[PDB]
Coordinates of all heavy atoms in Angstrom, one line a residue:
Chain A
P542 N -2.5 -18.0 -36.3 CA -1.2 -17.5 -36.0 C -1.3 -16.4 -35.0 O -2.3 -15.7 -34.9 CB -0.8 -16.9 -37.4 CG -1.5 -17.7 -38.3 CD -2.9 -17.8 -37.7
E543 N -0.2 -16.2 -34.2 CA -0.2 -15.1 -33.2 C 0.2 -13.8 -33.9 O -0.2 -12.7 -33.5 CB 0.8 -15.4 -32.0 CG 0.7 -16.9 -31.5 CD 0.7 -17.0 -29.9 OE1 0.1 -16.1 -29.3 OE2 1.3 -18.0 -29.4
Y544 N 0.9 -13.9 -35.0 CA 1.3 -12.7 -35.8 C 1.0 -13.1 -37.3 O 0.9 -14.2 -37.6 CB 2.9 -12.4 -35.7 CG 3.4 -12.4 -34.2 CD1 3.5 -13.6 -33.5 CD2 3.9 -11.2 -33.7 CE1 4.0 -13.6 -32.1 CE2 4.4 -11.2 -32.3 CZ 4.4 -12.4 -31.6 OH 4.9 -12.4 -30.3
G545 N 1.0 -12.0 -38.1 CA 0.7 -12.3 -39.5 C 2.0 -12.7 -40.2 O 3.0 -12.8 -39.6
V546 N 1.9 -12.8 -41.6 CA 3.1 -13.2 -42.3 C 4.0 -12.0 -42.7 O 5.1 -12.3 -43.3 CB 2.7 -13.9 -43.6 CG1 1.9 -15.2 -43.3 CG2 1.8 -12.9 -44.4
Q547 N 3.7 -10.8 -42.3 CA 4.6 -9.7 -42.6 C 5.2 -9.7 -43.9 O 6.4 -9.7 -44.1 CB 5.7 -9.6 -41.6 CG 5.5 -9.1 -40.3 CD 6.4 -9.8 -39.3 OE1 6.4 -11.1 -39.2 NE2 7.1 -9.0 -38.5
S548 N 4.4 -9.8 -45.0 CA 4.9 -9.8 -46.3 C 5.6 -8.5 -46.7 O 6.3 -8.4 -47.6 CB 3.8 -10.2 -47.4 OG 2.6 -10.1 -46.8
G549 N 5.3 -7.5 -45.8 CA 6.0 -6.2 -46.0 C 7.5 -6.3 -45.8 O 8.2 -5.8 -46.6
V550 N 7.8 -7.0 -44.7 CA 9.2 -7.1 -44.3 C 10.1 -7.8 -45.3 O 10.0 -9.0 -45.5 CB 9.4 -7.8 -43.0 CG1 10.8 -7.8 -42.6 CG2 8.6 -7.0 -42.0
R551 N 11.0 -7.1 -45.9 CA 11.9 -7.6 -46.9 C 12.8 -8.8 -46.4 O 12.8 -9.8 -47.0 CB 12.8 -6.5 -47.5 CG 12.0 -5.4 -48.1 CD 10.9 -5.9 -49.1 NE 10.2 -4.9 -49.9 CZ 10.5 -4.6 -51.1 NH1 11.5 -5.2 -51.7 NH2 9.8 -3.7 -51.7
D552 N 13.5 -8.5 -45.3 CA 14.4 -9.5 -44.8 C 13.5 -10.6 -44.0 O 13.0 -10.3 -43.0 CB 15.3 -8.9 -43.8 CG 16.3 -9.9 -43.2 OD1 15.8 -11.1 -43.0 OD2 17.4 -9.6 -42.9
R553 N 13.4 -11.8 -44.6 CA 12.5 -12.8 -43.9 C 13.0 -13.2 -42.5 O 12.1 -13.6 -41.7 CB 12.3 -14.0 -44.8 CG 11.6 -13.7 -46.1 CD 11.6 -14.9 -46.9 NE 10.4 -15.7 -46.6 CZ 9.3 -15.7 -47.4 NH1 9.3 -14.9 -48.4 NH2 8.3 -16.5 -47.0
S554 N 14.3 -13.1 -42.3 CA 14.8 -13.5 -41.0 C 14.4 -12.5 -39.9 O 14.7 -12.7 -38.8 CB 16.3 -13.8 -41.1 OG 17.1 -12.7 -41.3
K555 N 13.8 -11.3 -40.3 CA 13.5 -10.4 -39.3 C 12.0 -10.5 -39.0 O 11.4 -9.8 -38.1 CB 13.8 -8.9 -39.8 CG 15.2 -8.5 -39.6 CD 15.4 -7.0 -40.1 CE 16.7 -6.3 -39.8 NZ 16.5 -4.9 -39.9
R556 N 11.3 -11.3 -39.7 CA 9.8 -11.5 -39.5 C 9.5 -12.5 -38.3 O 10.4 -13.3 -37.9 CB 9.2 -12.1 -40.7 CG 9.5 -11.4 -42.0 CD 8.9 -12.2 -43.1 NE 8.7 -11.4 -44.3 CZ 8.3 -11.9 -45.5 NH1 8.1 -13.2 -45.6 NH2 8.2 -11.1 -46.5
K557 N 8.3 -12.4 -37.8 CA 7.9 -13.3 -36.8 C 7.8 -14.7 -37.3 O 8.1 -15.6 -36.6 CB 6.6 -12.8 -36.1 CG 6.6 -11.4 -35.7 CD 7.6 -11.1 -34.5 CE 7.8 -9.7 -34.4 NZ 8.5 -9.3 -33.1
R558 N 7.4 -14.8 -38.6 CA 7.3 -16.1 -39.2 C 8.1 -16.1 -40.5 O 7.5 -16.0 -41.6 CB 5.8 -16.4 -39.5 CG 5.0 -16.4 -38.3 CD 3.5 -16.2 -38.6 NE 3.0 -17.3 -39.3 CZ 1.9 -17.3 -40.0 NH1 1.2 -16.2 -40.1 NH2 1.4 -18.4 -40.6
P559 N 9.4 -16.2 -40.4 CA 10.2 -16.2 -41.6 C 9.7 -17.1 -42.7 O 9.5 -16.6 -43.8 CB 11.6 -16.6 -41.1 CG 11.6 -16.0 -39.7 CD 10.2 -16.4 -39.2
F560 N 9.6 -18.4 -42.4 CA 9.1 -19.3 -43.4 C 8.0 -20.2 -43.0 O 8.1 -21.4 -42.8 CB 10.3 -20.1 -43.8 CG 11.5 -19.3 -44.1 CD1 12.5 -19.0 -43.2 CD2 11.7 -18.8 -45.4 CE1 13.6 -18.2 -43.5 CE2 12.8 -18.0 -45.7 CZ 13.7 -17.7 -44.8
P561 N 6.8 -19.6 -43.0 CA 5.5 -20.2 -42.7 C 5.3 -21.5 -43.3 O 4.9 -22.5 -42.7 CB 4.5 -19.1 -43.2 CG 5.3 -17.9 -43.0 CD 6.6 -18.2 -43.5
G562 N 5.6 -21.5 -44.6 CA 5.4 -22.7 -45.4 C 6.1 -24.0 -44.9 O 5.5 -25.1 -45.0
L563 N 7.3 -23.9 -44.4 CA 8.1 -25.1 -43.9 C 7.4 -25.9 -42.9 O 7.4 -27.1 -42.9 CB 9.4 -24.6 -43.4 CG 10.2 -23.6 -44.2 CD1 11.6 -23.5 -43.7 CD2 10.3 -23.9 -45.6
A564 N 6.7 -25.2 -42.0 CA 6.0 -25.9 -40.9 C 5.2 -27.1 -41.4 O 4.9 -28.0 -40.7 CB 5.0 -24.9 -40.2
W565 N 4.8 -27.0 -42.7 CA 4.0 -28.1 -43.3 C 4.8 -29.4 -43.4 O 4.3 -30.5 -43.1 CB 3.6 -27.7 -44.7 CG 2.7 -28.8 -45.4 CD1 3.1 -29.6 -46.4 CD2 1.4 -29.1 -45.1 NE1 2.0 -30.4 -46.7 CE2 0.9 -30.1 -45.9 CE3 0.4 -28.5 -44.2 CZ2 -0.4 -30.6 -45.9 CZ3 -0.8 -29.1 -44.1 CH2 -1.2 -30.1 -45.0
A566 N 6.1 -29.3 -43.6 CA 7.1 -30.4 -43.7 C 7.2 -31.2 -42.3 O 7.1 -32.4 -42.2 CB 8.4 -30.0 -44.1
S567 N 7.4 -30.4 -41.3 CA 7.6 -31.0 -39.9 C 6.2 -31.3 -39.3 O 6.2 -31.8 -38.2 CB 8.3 -30.0 -39.1 OG 7.7 -28.7 -39.2
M568 N 5.1 -31.1 -40.0 CA 3.8 -31.4 -39.5 C 3.5 -32.9 -39.2 O 3.1 -33.2 -38.1 CB 2.7 -30.9 -40.5 CG 1.3 -31.4 -40.0 SD 0.0 -31.1 -41.1 CE 0.8 -31.4 -42.7
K569 N 3.7 -33.7 -40.2 CA 3.4 -35.1 -40.0 C 4.3 -35.6 -38.8 O 3.9 -36.4 -38.0 CB 3.8 -35.9 -41.3 CG 3.9 -37.4 -41.1 CD 2.6 -38.1 -41.6 CE 2.8 -39.6 -41.7 NZ 1.7 -40.3 -42.3
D570 N 5.5 -35.1 -38.8 CA 6.4 -35.4 -37.7 C 5.9 -35.0 -36.3 O 5.7 -35.8 -35.5 CB 7.7 -34.9 -38.0 CG 8.7 -35.1 -36.9 OD1 8.5 -34.5 -35.8 OD2 9.6 -35.9 -37.1
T571 N 5.7 -33.7 -36.1 CA 5.3 -33.2 -34.9 C 4.0 -33.7 -34.4 O 3.9 -34.2 -33.2 CB 5.2 -31.6 -34.9 OG1 6.6 -31.1 -34.9 CG2 4.4 -31.1 -33.8
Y572 N 3.0 -33.6 -35.2 CA 1.7 -34.1 -34.8 C 1.3 -35.5 -35.2 O 0.2 -36.0 -34.9 CB 0.6 -33.1 -35.3 CG 0.9 -31.7 -34.8 CD1 1.6 -30.8 -35.7 CD2 0.6 -31.3 -33.6 CE1 1.9 -29.5 -35.2 CE2 0.9 -30.0 -33.1 CZ 1.5 -29.1 -33.9 OH 1.8 -27.8 -33.5
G573 N 2.2 -36.2 -36.0 CA 1.9 -37.5 -36.4 C 1.3 -38.5 -35.4 O 0.2 -38.9 -35.6
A574 N 2.1 -38.7 -34.3 CA 1.6 -39.6 -33.2 C 0.2 -39.3 -32.7 O -0.3 -40.2 -32.0 CB 2.6 -39.5 -32.1
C575 N -0.4 -38.2 -33.0 CA -1.7 -38.0 -32.5 C -2.7 -39.1 -33.0 O -2.6 -39.4 -34.2 CB -2.3 -36.6 -32.8 SG -3.7 -36.2 -31.9
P576 N -3.6 -39.5 -32.2 CA -4.6 -40.5 -32.6 C -5.5 -40.1 -33.8 O -5.4 -40.6 -34.9 CB -5.4 -40.7 -31.3 CG -4.4 -40.6 -30.3 CD -3.6 -39.4 -30.7
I577 N -6.3 -39.1 -33.6 CA -7.1 -38.6 -34.6 C -6.4 -37.8 -35.7 O -7.1 -37.0 -36.4 CB -8.3 -37.8 -34.1 CG1 -7.8 -36.5 -33.5 CG2 -9.0 -38.6 -33.1 CD1 -8.9 -35.5 -33.2
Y578 N -5.1 -37.9 -35.8 CA -4.4 -37.1 -36.8 C -5.1 -37.2 -38.1 O -5.8 -36.3 -38.6 CB -3.0 -37.5 -36.9 CG -2.1 -36.8 -37.8 CD1 -1.0 -36.1 -37.4 CD2 -2.4 -36.7 -39.2 CE1 -0.1 -35.5 -38.3 CE2 -1.6 -36.1 -40.1 CZ -0.4 -35.5 -39.6 OH 0.4 -34.9 -40.6
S579 N -4.7 -38.3 -38.9 CA -5.3 -38.5 -40.2 C -6.6 -37.9 -40.4 O -6.8 -37.2 -41.4 CB -5.3 -40.0 -40.4 OG -5.8 -40.6 -39.2
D580 N -7.5 -38.2 -39.5 CA -8.9 -37.7 -39.5 C -8.9 -36.2 -39.7 O -9.5 -35.6 -40.6 CB -9.7 -38.0 -38.3 CG -9.8 -39.5 -38.0 OD1 -8.7 -40.2 -37.9 OD2 -11.0 -39.9 -37.9
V581 N -8.3 -35.5 -38.7 CA -8.2 -34.0 -38.8 C -7.8 -33.5 -40.1 O -8.5 -32.7 -40.8 CB -7.3 -33.4 -37.7 CG1 -7.4 -31.9 -37.7 CG2 -7.7 -34.0 -36.3
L582 N -6.7 -34.1 -40.7 CA -6.2 -33.6 -42.0 C -7.3 -33.7 -43.1 O -7.2 -33.0 -44.1 CB -5.0 -34.4 -42.4 CG -3.7 -33.9 -41.7 CD1 -2.6 -34.2 -42.7 CD2 -3.8 -32.5 -41.5
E583 N -8.2 -34.6 -42.9 CA -9.3 -34.8 -43.9 C -10.4 -33.7 -43.6 O -10.8 -33.0 -44.5 CB -9.9 -36.2 -43.9 CG -9.0 -37.2 -44.5 CD -9.5 -38.6 -44.2 OE1 -10.7 -38.8 -44.2 OE2 -8.6 -39.5 -43.9
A584 N -10.8 -33.7 -42.3 CA -11.8 -32.7 -41.9 C -11.4 -31.4 -42.6 O -12.2 -30.6 -43.1 CB -11.9 -32.6 -40.4
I585 N -10.1 -31.0 -42.5 CA -9.6 -29.8 -43.0 C -9.8 -29.8 -44.5 O -10.6 -29.1 -45.0 CB -8.1 -29.6 -42.7 CG1 -7.9 -29.5 -41.3 CG2 -7.6 -28.4 -43.4 CD1 -6.5 -29.1 -40.9
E586 N -9.0 -30.7 -45.1 CA -9.1 -30.9 -46.6 C -10.5 -30.6 -47.1 O -10.7 -29.8 -48.0 CB -8.6 -32.3 -47.0 CG -8.4 -32.4 -48.5 CD -7.4 -31.3 -49.0 OE1 -6.2 -31.5 -48.8 OE2 -7.9 -30.4 -49.6
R587 N -11.4 -31.3 -46.5 CA -12.8 -31.2 -46.9 C -13.2 -29.7 -46.6 O -13.3 -28.9 -47.5 CB -13.7 -32.1 -46.0 CG -15.2 -31.9 -46.2 CD -16.0 -33.0 -45.5 NE -15.7 -33.2 -44.0 CZ -16.3 -32.5 -43.0 NH1 -17.3 -31.6 -43.3 NH2 -16.0 -32.8 -41.8

Side-chain angles (χ1 to χ4, degrees):
Chain A
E543 314 226 38
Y544 312 67
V546 297
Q547 284 147 303
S548 8
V550 182
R551 301 315 188 95
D552 181 327
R553 297 176 88 96
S554 68
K555 278 182 171 198
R556 307 174 161 175
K557 306 293 167 170
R558 306 158 64 197
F560 309 94
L563 319 190
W565 185 254
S567 47
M568 173 189 37
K569 167 99 166 185
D570 175 292
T571 282
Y572 304 99
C575 194
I577 66 168
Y578 182 123
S579 41
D580 299 60
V581 185
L582 282 211
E583 283 167 44
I585 296 190
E586 190 55 74
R587 171 173 57 90

